[PDB]
């Protein structure tokens, strides 16, 4: 389980659809929109052509963080790269490996925990579409990056997690020992502090120290604001064992009002103690 | 300088939750000795700590810890039946570990860092009322080799207060030029803050100081922080700037205007402070 | 083009505080040419700056700097008798230093970084009124060997404004594809912000560039920031993405909706911007 060298041109169809009760979501297939939208992952060097269709009765767009795009795939009304109702457009995202420039400085690669979202619904900064649920995670991996057993996306969108009703999680299940990858994105109006019980991570690209010389901070509590994105991998229950491990925003009124879910770590027989 | 040793001791300490003057509540290591912030707990990586906990209050209370190892039975949440009924007792166990290699080739981070414990049960199932009342405290886990300070001070931005104190009442912390001073900085509650120190700066990393010339960590004097963030650092008091009454404060402008200010009082060897009135 | 030299020279500038139209206030290096942000001040580690300061206004004002070394007499605070009366003058003295090894074996962090200065006295004793009015500016301290830019631009999030400008009025900055553009980014006031740049990214470290393949610093295009935070980076204009009208904005949704947006206009060599249609 280690990511390869990138460099493939790949193609994906994507759709924007209305969901129940005023919401809106991205999907890989019509009738399959989700909140958050589909996970996209790539290897540094890959190119991705998103053959995008707006099935909605209002204009919509797709704007991505981190990845390379020319201005024609900005996905903004300002640069006239939104999609009209019933319309179709191909968005192109590219990625690159790190390397030394001609001027001698080091050019950072595209790898990271990134995300895409709408930019034109409600306002010309996508305020309505993001509130409605038009956001999704993008993982760009670097060659040799350790691959996880599972990937789970947690989005703090105003006072919700993934636009869900308060105090309804979501929960994620794992088994003690699993290598679990979390992708953490924030949207909207408020700052938050994402906290996990039982587990901790490095505040750097991959969430893991690169070895004994990495001076990165090891934390279990990270402040974050609109359009911030980070990720990390942990070994479930490592050093702490099985249980219902809570994650939540640590802003006191936010947890109290429902920004909480469970990381359910099972013992090899499936049981979870005290839960 | 003096350095932390390797860890591995199994330790035991009694702790109590007591009601304090003015609606407050605090932790302490001996009866009648609770404080806000609670007592500084110091461990070397690999140490174990058994907290024999006693709740002397009329409300359930708990003890939850950041960053350290613990099993689900020491979660300190009502959700996993780990709170302490009024008058009750419970042994909370925290463990730590050193960094090292896993079979998968990845590096496992250690427990070292600037952590903190708080209540999870008073007021709400997230300790909102308990934190407000003052049930928080710092925990430092040291890695083998860490430089040891001449003194450690704990600054906690709890909502609009520093350490639950009234506006414009510090706390003030005294040192002499040349002292190696360790700040532990915790934030709690509802609001974001930015911690700023006049005349001093630190590295935004684990220890607060650069490991050497190849360390790319940013050097700052202003750090945004939100509820349950904890970071720490060590500075040489007055290094390159001299003695005097050096302000620390939140840099959110209405927060400093309203009293989130204290004084780092750096003295000359003779104990005086140039241009300052006690 | 080129690289920062080793610092060490003693320097002089005159700085003025002036009233500006619309109730604003600004600093400048020459009378009648105050600006918001204030004039950019550049030093190399080890340089000393003597600022002969004149307050041309009818209320007290001060000059306080982040990051740099100063004695308590150059704190710029009323609290330490370091403000300037109406009509008065005062020499503020800033020092900087190189990184190095201390006697007790630890590494002293240098002064290099993206810093800033601002008033501490107009409105409140934390300069709440001066900062609102526009009394802030950038200070760069470079390390020996730092790459130098083609151009430097200062972007200041001051409450719900950029550089005290009306909503949706920029500023816009122009480059040519391939230009090495430095950004100095400073936040002031009451609110937290998230600084976002379309089509470009940087490392969240001191220089904003990874020191090499061993640098673990995060790469981002969105940084949370709060009052008195300062960071900076250098980017290659259009690098890997080309020409266009690339927006930068605050990504807090209502903040962008209500004005906190500008444009990084990157031009082809012939000077055109494809599909720029204002
Ligand atoms: Cu929150
Ligand atoms: Cu965005
Ligand atoms: Cu504050
Ligand atoms: Cu907590
Ligand atoms: Cu903003
Ligand atoms: Cu300041
Ligand atoms: O955006």
Author numbering:
A (entry chain C): 41 to 315
B (entry chain B), C (entry chain A): 40 to 317
What does the paper say about this structure?
Laccases (benzenediol:oxygen oxidoreductases) are copper-containing enzymes that catalyze the oxidation of diverse compounds by molecular oxygen. The active center of laccases contains four copper ions: A blue (Cu1) mononuclear copper center (T1) and a trinuclear copper cluster (T2/T3); the latter consists of the mononuclear T2 copper ion (Cu2) and two T3 copper ions (Cu3α and Cu3β). T1 acts as a center for the reception of electrons from the reducing substrate, while the TNC serves as a binding site for the molecular oxygen and its reduction to water. Three-domain (3D) laccases are monomers consisting of three cupredoxin-type domains. two-domain (2D) laccases consist of two domains and exist as homotrimer, with the T2/T3 located at the interface of domain 2 and domain 1 of neighboring molecules, and T1 located near the surface of domain 2.
We considered that the replacement of the His165 (“gateway” of the proposed tunnel) to alanine could fix the tunnel in an open state, and the hydrophobic phenylalanine should close the tunnel. In the case of substitutions for phenylalanine (H165F and I170F), the tunnels were closed. His165Phelow Cu was obtained from an overproducer strain cultivated with 0.25 mM CuSO4. The structures of SgfSL, and its mutant forms with sufficient occupancy of copper ions, were obtained via the cultivation of the corresponding over-producer, the E. coli strain, in a medium with a high concentration of copper(II) sulfate (1 mM); in the case of cultivation with 0.25 mM CuSO4, the laccase crystal structures were deprived of copper. In line with our hypothesis, His165Phe variant showed drastically reduced turnover rates for ABTS; its catalytic efficiency decreased by a factor of 255 compared to SgfSL wt. We propose that shuttering the T3β tunnel in the His165Phe mutant may impede copper ion access to the TNC. This would explain why saturation of TNC with copper ions could only be reached at the increased (1 mM) copper content in the growth medium. The shuttering of the T3β tunnel likely impedes the access of dioxygen to the TNC, which would be in agreement with the fact that both His165Phe and His165Phelow Cu variants were inactive. Thus the Phe at the position 165 may hinder the access of both dioxygen and Cu ions to the TNC via the T3β tunnel.
